[model samples]
Target: MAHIIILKSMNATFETKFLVVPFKPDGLKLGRPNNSGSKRDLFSQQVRPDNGNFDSRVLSRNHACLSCDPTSGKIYIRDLKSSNGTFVNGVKIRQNDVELKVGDMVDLGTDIDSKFEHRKISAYVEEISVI
Candidate 1:
C-alpha cells in the first residue's frame, strides 16, 4: 500500500508543490529516454538494479515514479533517465533509490554546467497512505 504525490511548478520561485494521490500502487511504470533526442522508454525500470548505481541526471526529463516497500513501509524514489537531474533533499542521489519519509523534499532540474538565472525546481511531499 503506497501513494504518490505530484508536485507541480507554481510560480518562478522554482519551488514545486505536491498533490497527494492516495491509494496509488507501490510499483508503477514510468518513461525515460534511451539517448539524447531519442524515443522515450515507457517500461523503464524505476528501481535501481541490485549492485547497480543510478546517474545523477536520471530524472531530468520531468517524470518519475516512486515505489514503497509494503513490509518496511519505506518509500523509494527513482530517476527516469532525465536530462537534468533528480535530487532528494539537498544531496544528489546515485545508484540506489533513496528512502523517503513524510514531508521530504525532492528537487528536479537540468544538468546545465553554467549557472544561469532561472527559477529553481521544487517538489513537496503531499501524503503517504495505504490502500
Candidate 2:
C-alpha cells in the first residue's frame, strides 16, 4: 500500500488532488488521456483535472513516470522525453531522474502563453506514505 497524494494545479484558476499507487515494480506512468493504442496509452494512470480538460499544447502524450521503492521508502520521477518537458521544483530534468520529497513541485509543462494561465499543468508531492 505504497502511495503518494499529489495536488494538481492548472495555474491560478483552480486545483485538485489525487492519489497514485505504484505498488508494482514497474510503477505508474503519468501522461495524457484518450490516446488509445499508442505510446501514450502505456500509462497505468492518467493526469488531468476532474473535467479532463488538459491542453495538449501544455502537456505531452506521455509526460512522466513515478515509482516508489518499498525497501528504501523513496519515490522517484523521470521525464519520458515529453515535448514541453517536465520540471521538478522549477528545475527542468536533464536525463537524470529525481527522488521526490515532500513539498517538491512537479510542473507538467511550461506556460507557453501568458494570456491563458489555465493551460499550465503542475503537481506537488503533498504527502508520501509507504505502509
Candidate 3:
C-alpha cells in the first residue's frame, strides 16, 4: 500500500497549522518553499533558526523531509542538517534519519511550549478490476 506523512504546526496556545505532503516515490521537498525578507530562497533551501513566535516564523527557512521507499513500504524523516535540529519522538536526531509512525511527534526546535503538532496530509488512489 502507498504511504503518506502528515505535518502539523502549533504554538504555546493552540494548533496553528500543518502541511500534508504526499510521500514521493523519489524524494519529497520539505524546506521553506517561501522566500523571506533575507531573500533566502534566492539561493538555496537552507534550514534557519527562528525563536520569534509560534507562527510560521518559528520554522526555519528549510526544514526536514519525510521520505518513503522499499524495505517493504517504510518511511523515514531526515534532518536537512537543520541548525536547531529535528526532534523525533523526543530524540535529537540531526545526525541521522529517523523512522516514524502515524502518531509520532516532531519538534522543529526545542519548541516554544513543547506541545503542538505541525503537519497533516491525505492522499490516496483506488481502482477496480474484475476478471
Predicted model with the maximum lDDT: 2
lDDT of 3 by residue, 1-131 (tens): 44544344432332322233234445454444353555644433332222112233435555676666555455667777765666776677874557766567666654343333342211111111111
TM-score of 1: 0.49
Order the candidate numbers by TM-score, best to worst: 2, 3, 1
What order do you get sorting by lDDT, best first? 2, 1, 3
Candidate 1 — worst ten consecutive residues by lDDT sum? 46-55
lDDT of 2 by residue, 1-131 (tens): 64655555635533565556564367566655555676544432443442222444567666777777767767888888988888889999954568888788888777667555436577666777754
Following a full C-alpha superposition, what root-mean-square deviation does model 2 have from the true structure?
4.8
Q: Which candidate is the best by TM-score?
A: 2
Model 1 agreement with the true structure over 53-95: per-residue lDDT tens digits: 1223333333555666656656677666555556787776654
Instruction: Give RMSD to native, each candidate.
Output: 9.0, 4.8, 9.4
Report the Cα lDDT for residue 72, model 1: 63
**How close to the true structure is residue 63 of candidate 2, measured as C-alpha lDDT?**
75
Error of 1 at 43 (Å): 16
